[PDB]
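Cross-posted from the bioinformatics board.
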Amino acid sequence: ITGTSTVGVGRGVLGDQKNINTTYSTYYYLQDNTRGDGIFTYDAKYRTTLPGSLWADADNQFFASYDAPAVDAHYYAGVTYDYYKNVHNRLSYDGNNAAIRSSVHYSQGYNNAFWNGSEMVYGDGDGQTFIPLSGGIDVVAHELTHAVTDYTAGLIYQNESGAINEAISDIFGTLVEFYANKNPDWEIGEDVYTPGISGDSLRSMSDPAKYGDPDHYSKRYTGTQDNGGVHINSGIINKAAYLISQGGTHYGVSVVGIGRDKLGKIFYRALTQYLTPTSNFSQLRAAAVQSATDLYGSTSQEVASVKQAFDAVGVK
Ligand SMILES: CC(C)C[C@H](N)C(=O)NO
Ligand SMILES: [Ca+2]
Ligand SMILES: [Ca+2]
Ligand SMILES: [Ca+2]
Ligand SMILES: [Ca+2]
Ligand SMILES: [Zn+2]
């Protein structure tokens, strides 16, 4: 829409208040003009038809409960774009400031969120397994990161290249969560998952086994569901990513941790410079070691800890 940029206030899914960038043209629109070519939030109105309608509000106040998911989808897209741009110097997920579009209230009691190749979609949950998914910033950055992969390595969604795809998104969704200082952890979806249980989460990076995910290559899942287990085998790469950053002894293998700043940067480089659409876990390791070596040198500690962590997980 063409209009004047302004700022509005709303309450998020968790009941937290915030300011969001909007646009004024008779109605106040969930259109942010300050980031790239902008961020657009739509109302899917409980249908499956996308994107649906650009969100329109009459007073610039988004305190209704129906408003909660649009607020968070919109804002959280905004800090993710910021993290990318400030930390890896990337403009938007394509590297060129493309517009970010998000649709909220998709279907009825849809327990999930996704990147469909051109926009982000968020269900509202059944209200028991999940609450509106845009409420989790790690969910929101996990999804945007899928855009980012699609435009860089392009990892096909299945088997090992697809588990690497899902672990990238979970690694940067977690870096984004730490980036915002929004109560960070090494957990996924904890904030929107099972409103009645406490302390649980979708997946764990620190201990993928908590919830049954392999934490070792020898545990790798070989069937067929979940596209050859894209969301299962991703735990092997999450565990490795977790050890490099924090350090630890996994299966008798000791890793000195180099911290998260450096984990973000050796991964963003592997992802943008050496990963290909068909890369497998042995190729990710070569790529991570090669990036670590590019940045810190051949004989660095950083180079040594990425080797150690892939060795602890049994990758190669
Ligand atoms: C993990 C969910 C919260 C979202 C879906 N599971 C996914 O990988 N989207 O990318
Ligand atoms: Ca209003
Ligand atoms: Ca958290
Ligand atoms: Ca988390
Ligand atoms: Ca819970
Ligand atoms: Zn995903």
